[PDB]
Enzyme design. Structure first.
Site, PDB file in Angstrom:
ATOM      1  N   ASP A  32       0.804  -1.217   0.000  1.00 26.03           N
ATOM      2  CA  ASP A  32       0.000   0.000   0.000  1.00 26.03           C
ATOM      3  C   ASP A  32       0.840   1.271   0.000  1.00 26.03           C
ATOM      4  O   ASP A  32       0.294   2.352   0.245  1.00 26.03           O
ATOM      5  CB  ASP A  32      -0.949   0.005   1.204  1.00 26.03           C
ATOM      6  N   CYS A  84       5.369  -0.049   2.854  1.00 27.13           N
ATOM      7  CA  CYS A  84       6.033  -1.316   3.139  1.00 27.13           C
ATOM      8  C   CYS A  84       7.275  -1.134   3.999  1.00 27.13           C
ATOM      9  O   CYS A  84       7.636  -2.042   4.758  1.00 27.13           O
ATOM     10  CB  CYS A  84       6.393  -2.018   1.834  1.00 27.13           C
ATOM     11  N   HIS A 133       9.952  -2.523  -3.474  1.00 24.13           N
ATOM     12  CA  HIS A 133       9.189  -3.125  -2.389  1.00 24.13           C
ATOM     13  C   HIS A 133      10.117  -3.505  -1.243  1.00 24.13           C
ATOM     14  O   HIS A 133      11.229  -3.992  -1.468  1.00 24.13           O
ATOM     15  CB  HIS A 133       8.424  -4.365  -2.870  1.00 24.13           C
TER      16      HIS A 133
END
Lengths: 348, 75
Positions: A97, A100, A248
């Site tokens: 979202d 992370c 990420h």
């Protein structure tokens, strides 16, 4: 597929008990020090053993919890789990979202995501509500060499830095752009000073071109982040290990069942027959001059014999914390009992 | 016209642009080629960081010019 994809889903009520402790554990001093955690930054999650179960059942567990894409990228790129002398690390799945970094970090210490935006909001207030001159100094100094101003020939007026710095401040907020703004290296460094705990980030060295497969640009995120706004004696000397890939962040936790292999992360990458030191981020020129003495203070450095390019080679590594989460706030205990219950049923 | 965008590795990509395209336009074609978002791109030419609003010709960028791309990658 019955097993959940996140550890905290085993006992959401316990996960709420944890997420409700983090806000009350943050101390906001009236002196001007960065606000920080009193006690909870010393917690460490290790991940339960999986080698006990049968191979087919190891996959359903591994598929549920482990981020296979970041695991496969970093392992096959000789960046993760390359050293035969130390225990393995696995990447716990992490929400994407846009938070992370806080999600991965809270998972490493507590097992819960930053669902209530406690870490994220703690990062934003530091940048927004307090003096940030030292952070901006360190960030300017690194940017000059990182973005290679001398190479590209770039000149920044004083407004260029201000606009870029205000933008990093706005990035830390919880305003919607994904659900939240992604973050970059300086936010990690502020975060580690909020935790009084170092953050090692393990990642690939270069971003590849979709056209030619050749190197496109360097990833600068990997390396060591030291809580340098605090005396090392007032810091927790066991690091937080994060994994980075495809913009990420995930936590790189270690398995509780450790064989003879040592519970430590190497502070060195093996790139091309050479043991390259990890980048120590955002140091000043005096600090960089005593880089090793700082590392030996904010971490617990040891020498690990490793196979060298038919010979034995001595590299420096940082000891890793054992799992110290009490039963009341141990979501791994609950998830393990859930695994064993399903494993009994799976044998039918 | 053709211009060149060059990265810190020396990788250099060829773009098809008009002198009237904005910098964000230039950034858009880059995004579509290498999958990199515009907010995470920085284009430099002749010492100046190029602003999204201004035209390629506003920076006197002509045929076969070389731009520099630095990446503020996020996570």
């Amino acid at each position: 597929q019955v097993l959940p994809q996140a550890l905290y889903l085993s006992n959401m009520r316990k996960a709420v008990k944890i997420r409700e402790r983090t806000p009350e554990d943050i101390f906001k001093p009236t002196n001007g020090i960065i606000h920080h955690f009193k006690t909870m930054h010393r917690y460490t999650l290790e991940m339960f053993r999986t080698c006990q179960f049968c191979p087919q059942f190891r996959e359903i567990i591994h598929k549920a919890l482990i981020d296979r894409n970041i695991q496969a990228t970093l392992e096959s790129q000789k960046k993760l789990n390359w050293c035969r002398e130390v225990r393995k690390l696995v990447a716990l799945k992490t929400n994407g979202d846009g938070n992370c970094l806080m999600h991965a970090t809270s998972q490493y210490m507590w097992g819960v995501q930053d669902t209530d935006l406690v870490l994220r909001k703690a990062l934003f207030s530091t940048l927004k509500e307090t003096d940030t001159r030292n952070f901006k100094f360190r960030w300017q100094l690194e940017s000059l060499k990182s973005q290679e101003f001398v190479e590209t020939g770039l000149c920044y007026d004083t407004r260029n830095w201000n606009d870029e710095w205000d933008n990093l401040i706005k990035m830390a907020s919880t305003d919607t752009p994904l659900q939240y703004n992604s973050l970059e290296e300086i936010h990690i460094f502020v975060l580690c000073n909020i935790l009084r705990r170092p953050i090692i980030v393990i990642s690939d060295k270069m971003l590849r071109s979709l056209e030619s497969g050749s190197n496109f640009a360097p990833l600068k995120v990997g390396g060591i982040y030291l809580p340098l706004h605090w005396p090392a004696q007032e810091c927790y000397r066991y690091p937080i290990v994060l994994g980075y890939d495809s913009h990420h962040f995930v936590p790189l936790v270690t398995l509780k069942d450790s064989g003879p292999e040592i519970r430590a992360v190497p502070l060195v990458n093996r790139d091309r027959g050479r043991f390259e030191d990890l980048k120590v981020h955002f140091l000043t020129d005096p600090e960089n001059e005593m880089k090793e003495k700082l590392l030996k203070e904010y971490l617990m450095v040891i020498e690990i014999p490793v196979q060298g390019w038919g010979t034995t080679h001595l590299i420096n590594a940082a000891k890793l914390d054992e799992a110290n989460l009490p039963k009341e706030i141990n979501l791994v205990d609950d998830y393990f009992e859930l695994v064993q219950h399903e494993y009994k049923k799976w044998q039918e | 016209m053709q211009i060149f965008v060059k990265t810190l590795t020396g990788k250099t990509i060829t773009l098809e642009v008009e002198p009237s395209d904005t910098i964000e336009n230039v950034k858009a074609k880059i995004q579509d080629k290498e999958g990199i978002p515009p907010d995470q791109q920085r284009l430099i030419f002749a010492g100046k960081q190029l602003e999204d609003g201004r035209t390629l010709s506003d920076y006197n960028i002509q045929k076969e010019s070389t731009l520099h791309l630095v990446l503020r990658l996020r996570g």
